[PDB]
Design a binder for this molecule. Structure first.
Ligand SMILES: Nc1ncnc2c1ncn2[C@@H]1O[C@H](COP(=O)(O)OP(=O)(O)O)[C@@H](O)[C@H]1O
Ligand SMILES: Nc1ncnc2c1ncn2[C@@H]1O[C@H](COP(=O)(O)OP(=O)(O)O)[C@@H](O)[C@H]1O
Lengths: 197, 199
């Protein structure tokens, strides 16, 4: 009982068979703003809804796929480029891809977006501004990164963060808790047809 | 009214596999040009999707001009091409997806490095190496893109560069003896026999 047409499955075929549409949920924000805390909680929530969702962050990218990359300007650009391509591949597989990198530069995030929006069939790219004040992330500072200021070119302290002008989702994590941030993102996905009811 | 639950930290591998009713793995196809990797990969992916299983094909169409567009054709580029593909296929397996790679991957050391990414991973991930084995005579008869006839093309695997055949892979399929549906049946049966998809 094995059936297939010649060639590759189309995107509509895959989406229909798996009962799910792929997209990229692109988190951006300062260190300690809550990207990682929100991404792992959102991923679990979606998995409880029987949805394929997968988090991309430093833990599974930096020392594997991108282990060849340094911290010079060219390396940083290439790091985001490759994360953009990988996130697109996950979306093409009918998975909700959640990226949790500071991604400070407008141009880098824009090129990741264009890979999705210019894809032969356009793939949703949902930019989520995880927005916490500098005073809040310095008070949080769960790794001591802000106190070191012994660390150079640090986003928001000694390097620039380029805030998105008008992202698809804007979440102020000093006024919404983790569950509320997960609720906001999931409701956006549901209201835009990307996950079932 | 909401309905949200989660524990601190990341989902564990067993939690993810259980919630999704599926275990992730890499099905690594290797073989000569025109041996049937892409033909089998697209049929297999369709078959698994029909079983409501996440499966995803990695090949030249979605890798070469995207993630790996920076790479050329020198030996160093070639090694790096397979290296990255090994990492990406691992990420898909970690997502509880059946990742199917369809690259010639002619060198034993490159396939071995990809394999060790899976087998030495903190939680070990199955790496299923499938020798798509067709004689030089058959693939020269097939030559669906004229690649073997060009000989015009340099350092071509099986003609002017080596193919290092797997010694004893998890699956060995002679595509001059089995049709595409039978090749899909063998791989799918192996997946079920090893608990990676429901029976
Ligand atoms: N609403 C919220 N969302 C996310 N994190 C929060 C929130 N409120 C407080 N925090 C705390 O802020 C810190 C954010 O750390 P982390 O998720 O590692 O941020 P990032 O990945 O952006 O560097 C965590 O200690 C978290 O517990
Ligand atoms: N039993 C078989 N398995 C796979 N392909 C076959 C088989 N018999 C004939 N073919 C043909 O051989 C060619 C294989 O092409 P392709 O899948 O592109 O090989 P590769 O991906 O290894 O370069 C296709 O034309 C396909 O129709």
């Amino acid at each position: 009982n094995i059936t297939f047409h010649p060639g590759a499955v189309t995107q509509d075929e895959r989406d229909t068979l798996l009962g799910q549409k792929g997209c990229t949920v692109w988190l951006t924000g300062l260190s300690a703003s809550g990207k990682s805390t929100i991404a792992t909680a959102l991923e679990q929530h979606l998995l409880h809804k029987k949805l394929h969702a997968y988090r991309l962050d430093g833990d599974n990218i930096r020392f594997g796929l991108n282990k060849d990359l340094g911290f010079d300007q060219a390396s940083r650009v290439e790091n985001i480029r490759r994360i953009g391509e990988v996130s697109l591949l996950f979306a093409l597989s009918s998975t909700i891809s959640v990226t949790a990198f500071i991604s400070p530069y407008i141009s880098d995030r824009q090129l990741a977006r264009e890979l999705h929006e210019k894809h032969s069939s356009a793939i949703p790219f949902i930019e989520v501004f995880i927005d916490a004040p500098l005073s809040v992330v310095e008070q949080r500072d769960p790794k001591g990164l802000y106190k070191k200021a012994e660390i150079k070119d640090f986003t928001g302290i000694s390097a620039p963060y380029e805030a998105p002008a008008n992202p698809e989702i804007h979440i102020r994590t000093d006024e919404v808790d983790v569950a509320g941030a997960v609720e906001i993102i999931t409701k956006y996905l549901a209201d835009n047809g990307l996950i079932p009811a």
